[PDB]
């Protein structure tokens, strides 16, 4: 029962990002909606300070809420159980370039609105890398492994930037999600399949608009009857 | 490819720039070029590269005018300049029209050159063939030397191979590869609409009019498969610049840039080079114009004081 | 895919020879098995032939015991089956979530109708209280390997989750570069290979392992919004 | 856990009945204690003390190396091995200590005894060292109960397991499912035990129920300063303090590499003066993985102890 959590199936959301890439400080904001039972969302991101960006925008795409995840009945939704109070996450990104990024974010609930406040910090970005070169067209779909560690959930992911040369450039992302309150049941090992795309970007607008679909599921390969594990 | 704008109402539209430019008959065509006229005892000639025009320097040159006369041409077949008589736009054709245009400006005995991309190659060749007539050279994202390997270069090997093939002529002559995609991609900010309109205007129609943007990359001086004549030209002027101990130079590296990472090692084997760097990719003029202009201004001042 | 002819039939046998070194423990292993190169299933019996018993968790050498055993649909290029009759090679870098590292260099060739695989496995900087040194690992959970093309090579990248006796999990990042021995005609687009590697024939009899891998290649199952980037 | 056999272990395997046929039994209080005795060289006595889940069988391949140097005695703790059951069915640390001391008094031991303790068997020794400090000549310990546990920072992930054991759940974890015998013991040994070797450990706890109590009562005595048994905590603190002031008493610590508890206890073992350090490759039950190296280390340590008169 969603109403008990203080949530409705369709939730608006506002996000404020404070970021520092290299020695460039910036601040962005996002406005969007989404479906927390089915797992869709669309956010309109604009740069409030630091414009223009001397790097690829898509690095902060994952920084712009796992509440928008379609969890089936046979898998417990750790993020929906985490409300009304909300949940936080600490996220570490290692680009195959060798550069790093840290993303710490708080997701709270205010007047039927997901208030997300996120801090982004990247460094050691390679000069000839796709992030500095801005060769990135967008993100490909991904599979984030989710498992339980005591009272928290851990997701690990390989994100792939598609480049205008057709090549790809990956980064390894590990996120520790922590609910603010305890929850009744922790999930078994599973996956969240993601597809994040840029929808209306073709307009000569000064804002990006991204849409993410995320659906949780177990493996679709049958475990041989009595195998290990 | 995303990008976002900056600040708008200091903009110089296309027509605004062109209504300030002059024109002059050169050979069997004509050259369009901006001229600041004042302080004609020195001349700084600004040479744009592929896909661009004199418009590229619009926010750069206001810094250098109070100390010297700055002349900025649209290369032949580009910008508002006329077309080449035989319709060809290889390096030596641009050089022919440019050196003929040089005779009609009543320039000084020694000239300062500010070159970008292929305009830097034109300035380098003119310096090799007129070694005494050069007072100083400023270059950026330049054709510094021949290309023996692709190691530090941006991933453009397959792009160049396609352009040199027959694929290039539907790549650019029909879908405007260098203007519609490469030019916005290599600018850190999002160009205001009329700023991109100014760049697209000379090549807003499909066909041979976009040929200058196809022939420039087919000149690329690779030791393997590159046009042997252009490789010879580049070898010659690179050796000359390596030996030019007395020629003051200024290299404006672009951070992270496009070619700068792959070309600094070579641009650097040239003596008497003051090294500065500004934020941007390839077309660094649209990202750091005022800083670049201040650098060039102080460099020209220091050259003129000694 | 037209098996005509990479020198292969649908069901192929395979022998694998691994030379391994964990920290400074030198060991040798031999795998014997068979699989289906069109549906993506394989079963291998792995024996220790030198250096037994092992001072580490055995499961770290499981992904070293052949992407020819992959189920590729018609709408995705099968690089690995294209690589034959000569075969392919791969170089594999593993970074464990606690600090350890591992290099795996393997050569998959084809002789007399069988897959001859020669593997070199080396590990270092394994944490003393880590689940590999403590032998806390029950097995490998299913995984998803992102595959894409890089000119003439194919890069696969995945995370692998060891389930432990705790019920907790321990991950390691695995990046593999697959190089065909000869040029192939079609290099694939970005896709995934879903793996499930399990340990069968549990018994408690034996001092060997029997592991079965199912590998199904596929594109995403989420529909791409029309007009979206990229 | 996929573990492999030692290919050269079958040719010298000592089965359960083979080991038990080499052992004597003596009445101790209201029960009896089965034990092994090498008899010869009774001028010195080195006593091997096994820990939880095991018995004297644990030392079957370790003790030969030391036998030509001293008389070695290896008992089965009360209610474990082939020993007798405890009179009142209780199997706390002091319950083991009672029968252990009463068995000590019936062996004609030298005035100063050498002890080789493992797991809780070390605690016993340590306790007997704190209460009879003039009766100790040298102490050998490994994977031992050294000092109390105030934090889990260096320990294996056993906090939730301990919380389950000290709960009601532990009753069915141990008594009805034989946790330490069928799960902890084989998983904390690198090599795969021969079937007879594991049968030797399973035999004393082959049937379900109350006879498995010593394997459930031992972990519930864990000296956690928060949640542990207060009297056991005070005992451990007492003999830790006494061991810290033992510049006189020779010691040898055999570190298991990577081991189980050794990483979390080797620092505390460093705070014991006059402690030689050696290392063998194994997990918790290091005897089953490096018995001969252990035996030679301990033999030479005993010899060097018995030359500095």
From Swiss-Prot, chain B:
One Pfam family from the record: Abhydrolase_1
Catalytic function, reaction form: coelenterazine h + O2 = excited coelenteramide h monoanion + hnu + CO2 + H(+)
Activity-pH behavior: Optimum pH is 7.4.
Annotated GO CC locations: membrane
EC numbers on record: 1.13.12.5
InterPro entries found in the cross-reference section: AB_hydrolase_1 (IPR000073), AB_hydrolase_fold (IPR029058), AB_hydrolase_sf (IPR050266), Epox_hydrolase-like (IPR000639)
Binding site for substrate: 159, 282
Domain of life where this protein originates: Eukaryota
S-S bridge residues: none
UniProt GO BP: bioluminescence
UniProtKB keywords: Decarboxylase, Luminescence, Lyase, Monooxygenase, Oxidoreductase, Photoprotein
MF-aspect GO terms: carboxy-lyase activity; Renilla-luciferin 2-monooxygenase activity
Dependence of activity on temperature: Optimum temperature is 32 degrees Celsius.
Stated role: Upon binding the substrate, the enzyme catalyzes an oxygenation, producing a very short-lived hydroperoxide that cyclizes into a dioxetanone structure, which collapses, releasing a CO(2) molecule. The spontaneous breakdown of the dioxetanone releases the energy (about 50 kcal/mole) that is necessary to generate the excited state of the coelenteramide product, which is the singlet form of the monoanion. In vivo the product undergoes the process of nonradiative energy transfer to an accessory protein, a green fluorescent protein (GFP), which results in green bioluminescence.
Additional facts recorded: This luciferase produces light with a wavelength of 480 nm. In presence of a green fluorescence protein (GFP) it produces a green fluorescence at 509 nm.
Quaternary structure and partners: Monomer.
UniProt-recorded name of the protein: Coelenterazine h 2-monooxygenase
């Amino acid at each position: 029962d969603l109403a008990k959590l203080g949530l409705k199936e369709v939730m608006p959301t506002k996000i404020n990002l404070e970021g520092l890439v290299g020695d460039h400080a910036f601040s962005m904001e996002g406005v969007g909606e989404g479906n927390i039972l089915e797992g869709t969302q669309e956010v309109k991101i604009s740069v409030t300070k630091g414009a223009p960006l001397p790097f690829a925008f898509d690095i902060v795409s994952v920084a712009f809420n796992r509440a928008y995840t379609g969890y089936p009945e046979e898998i417990s939704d750790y993020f929906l159980q985490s409300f009304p109070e909300g949940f936080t996450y600490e996220r570490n990104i290692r680009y195959q370039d060798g550069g790093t990024a840290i993303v710490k974010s708080d997701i709270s609930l205010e007047d039927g609105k997901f208030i997300v406040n996120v801090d982004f910090k990247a460094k050691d970005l390679r000069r000839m890398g796709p992030v500095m070169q801005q060769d990135i067209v967008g993100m490909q779909p991904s599979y984030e492994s989710m498992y339980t560690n005591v009272t928290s959930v851990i997701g690990e992911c390989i994100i792939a930037f598609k480049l205008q040369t057709g090549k790809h450039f990956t980064y390894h992302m590990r996120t520790v999600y922590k609910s603010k309150k305890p929850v009744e049941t922790m999930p078994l090992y599973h996956f969240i399949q993601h597809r994040l795309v840029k929808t209306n970007v073709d307009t000569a607008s000064g804002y990006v608009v991204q849409h993410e679909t995320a659906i949780a599921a177990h493996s679709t390969i049958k475990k041989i009857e009595g195998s290990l594990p | 490819k995303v990008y976002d704008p900056e600040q708008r109402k200091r903009m110089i539209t296309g027509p605004q720039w062109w209504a300030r430019c002059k024109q002059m008959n050169v050979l069997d065509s004509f050259i369009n070029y901006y001229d600041s006229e004042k302080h004609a005892e020195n001349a700084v000639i600004f040479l744009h590269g592929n896909a661009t025009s004199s418009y590229l320097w619009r926010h750069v040159v206001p810094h250098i005018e109070p100390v010297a006369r700055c002349i900025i041409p649209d290369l032949i077949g580009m910008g508002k300049s006329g077309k080449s008589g035989n319709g060809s736009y290889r390096l030596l054709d641009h050089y022919k029209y440019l050196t003929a245009w040089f005779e009609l400006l009543n320039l000084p005995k020694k000239i300062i050159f500010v070159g970008h991309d292929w305009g830097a190659a034109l300035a380098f060749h003119y310096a090799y063939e007129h070694q005494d007539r050069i007072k100083a050279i400023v270059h950026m994202e330049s054709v510094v030397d021949v290309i023996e390997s692709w190691d530090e270069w941006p991933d453009i090997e397959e792009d160049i191979a396609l352009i040199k093939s027959e694929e290039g002529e539907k790549m650019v002559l029909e879908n405007n590869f260098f203007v519609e995609t490469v030019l916005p991609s290599k600018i850190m900010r999002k160009l205001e609409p009329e700023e991109f309109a100014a760049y697209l205007e000379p090549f807003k129609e499909k066909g041979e009019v976009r040929r200058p943007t196809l022939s420039w990359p087919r000149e690329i001086p690779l030791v393997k498969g590159g046009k042997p004549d252009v490789v010879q030209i580049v070898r010659n002027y690179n050796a000359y610049l390596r030996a030019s101990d007395d020629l003051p130079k200024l290299f404006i590296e672009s951070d992270p840039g496009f070619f700068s990472n792959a070309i600094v090692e070579g641009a650097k084997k040239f003596p008497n080079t003051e090294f500065v760097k500004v934020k941007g990719l390839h077309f660094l003029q649209e990202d750091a114009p005022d800083e670049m202009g201040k650098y060039i201004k102080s460099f020209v001042e220091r050259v003129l004081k000694n």
